[PDB]
């Protein structure tokens, strides 16, 4: 649950991990989805469209993998606005500096997108965020008031759907985590 | 992760919540699956069988709703041994102290206990109720057990924990019913 949180209606937060991608592309623009990754994103779009929900917004990382996952999923959700954000990117001892930076960035995403309620919300909301495993796991554990170690102990599939429900008083329920039940096992990957 | 734990191989723990059942049934023998519940169990059985895994065991609650969910799922898993246990039974929706103690006992007997005989990676199914599944997840991951009620598990859902030999635990999915059509999904 969440301290100092007050929103006007319930929020349904769907956190989608980007699909399988070419980790070894030289430049960020080369780090596109794999053919399997494109099929994963089709399955995720099919699933989301099948829920009978009107989504308010798709917010997505500006990394190539997340833009492409979004391009595919959005075809299934005609009329839903898309917002690109650099805040949901991952940055380029190296390890410690990178973790320090990533910590700040994932907390920033939490505060900006999850803890921050919109004063202009007028009904229950259904919000899609397409991004990466660190920020998704972190948001889940942060929202549920789990320990700082905790997010590293989750492991989420490519194209997976995580559903958090946030009540106006800040009560949080995790309805599903890392759901790829809608994908055949021969399409399921972690990277 | 878990302290005082050394296993020989990795264990894949699949925690399945019983399907939808008749909550108002008078006696425990009347609290059977609803027709939709039988449908949910079939979907969960189909999903489990599709994973290409030879499951080592199916451990289930001795409650009617769990026995019935198991009956259906086991049809999809021929040859897999089944063990009934009262350790996974739930009490009513200060007797609650002993129900609490029993979920800890369950965690200890089934999850924290590794088999010295198991030298190969194992795949273990537990079919039981939302309270003990949520507790197990929190305990295995060293989350505040009071976190338990922040987790919501659909009927017939699959929750998957991975336990490495050194006791490191990963949560791979929680409350997965993505294999069920939306109109078949229930929480009670
Ligand atoms: Cl991303
Ligand atoms: Cl049960």
Author numbering:
A (entry chain B): 88 to 179, 191 to 289
B (entry chain A): 88 to 180, 195 to 289
Q: What wording appears in the published article?
A:
PGAM5 is a mitochondrial membrane protein that functions as an atypical Ser/Thr phosphatase and is a regulator of oxidative stress response, necroptosis, and autophagy. Phosphoglycerate mutase family member 5 (PGAM5) is a mitochondrial membrane protein that belongs to the phosphoglycerate mutase (PGAM) branch of the histidine acid phosphatase superfamily, known also as two-histidine phosphatase (2H-phosphatase). Despite harboring a canonical RHGE catalytic motif, PGAM5 lacks a typical phosphotransferase and/or phosphohydrolase activity for small metabolites, and displays instead a phosphatase function specific for Ser/Thr and, potentially, histidine residues (Takeda et al., 2009, Panda et al., 2016).
Among a series of truncated proteins, the ΔN90-PGAM5 construct harboring the catalytic domain readily crystallized, enabling high-resolution structure determination to 1.70 Å. The last two strands formed an antiparallel arrangement, projecting the C-terminal tail in proximity to the active site situated on top of the β-sheet core. The two molecules of PGAM5 in the crystallographic asymmetric unit demonstrated a dimeric arrangement. Both subunits associated by aligning the β-sheet cores along the non-crystallographic two-fold symmetry with their active sites located at distal sites. Unlike the α4-β5 loop and β6 strand, the contribution of the C-terminal tails to dimeric intersubunit contacts was limited to only one hydrogen bond between the β6 D277 and the tail residue G279, prompting us to investigate the role of this region regarding the stability of the dimer. Consistently, the deletion of the C-terminal tail (ΔC-tail) almost completely abolished the association of this construct with full-length protein, an ability that was highly maintained in the other truncated variants retaining the C-terminal tail. These results therefore suggested that the C-terminal tail played an important stabilizing role in the dimeric assembly, which was also supported by the dissociation constant (KD) of ∼0.48 μM determined for the construct “d” (residues 90–289) by AUC equilibrium sedimentation experiments. As expected, the catalytic domain alone (ΔN90) lacked an ability to form large assemblies, and existed as a dimer in solution even at high protein concentration.
